[PDB]
């Protein structure tokens, strides 16, 4: 049970956070109305969220004599950095990073 | 005083290990003669030696958020792989490798 | 390393402490929107801040006879009086004043 997309199976995964603004009814009738509420004050919320994850490492412990290869940034000049904002503080990821540059016998 | 080759400038460097074989005389004279030996048995020798040396390391707290430079093997394919030995066992080092590769601000 | 400038030259400066505004969004769309926000309600900030240094003094333990040489201001009457504020209320400062003043032998 590994995900086809990728990443870790899980039977009890990190739960769903489901978070709602109260609704609050707009001015009632003065007279009683069985009907329920349909009016209401236009409003939404704003704030601050927090993700804070430990992970466990497997250190790599390879007895191979030549360098390996690793991920690297390209030395030449270019207009944009890569993973950084442009003139237009735009951020962007120009390309797709795996995890798989060292090297194990199998 | 840092080497201007590159290194460790040390005031008390690792000593100097001198290793020479003995002189064996070859067969003497039955009669006594004054004059130094200069005949001897023809000899080497050979020998293993370890040299074991424990390197203290500056861990890297850089906060870029951009991938660093990192050496690196090229993926492509080739007739030799880097830093072995060939056809012939000759080992051989392609290239030469420093070691500043990680950033830090001035 | 004395700076150029002027100053004392910190290895561990006082850190550099930086402020500012939580971006606060404006009125979001009632259909979700994978674009990050753009819009966001105008807003600045205004506050107090408190500096205090504590600061070593070597005190001039001078033998010299004759008076030396001391800042002062000058008694001669002027329209506006030196480092204070004009009519306009706009606070200057009239000249440099550096630190040496008194004399020590070499």
């Given at each position: ?73 390209n030395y030449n000049k270019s207009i944009n950095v890569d993973f950084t904002?442009d003139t237009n503080g735009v951020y962007s990821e120009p390309r797709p ?10």
């Open positions: 049970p590994s995900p086809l997309m990728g990443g870790f199976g899980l039977k009890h995964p990190p739960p769903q956070i489901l978070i709602k603004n109260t609704p609050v009814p707009a001015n009632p009738s003065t007279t009683f109305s069985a009907a329920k509420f349909a009016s209401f004050i236009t409003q939404y919320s704003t704030g601050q969220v927090s993700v804070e994850i430990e992970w466990e490492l497997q250190k790599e412990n390879s007895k191979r004599w030549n360098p390996e290869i690793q991920y690297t940034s904002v990073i795996g995890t798989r540059y060292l090297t194990r016998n199998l």
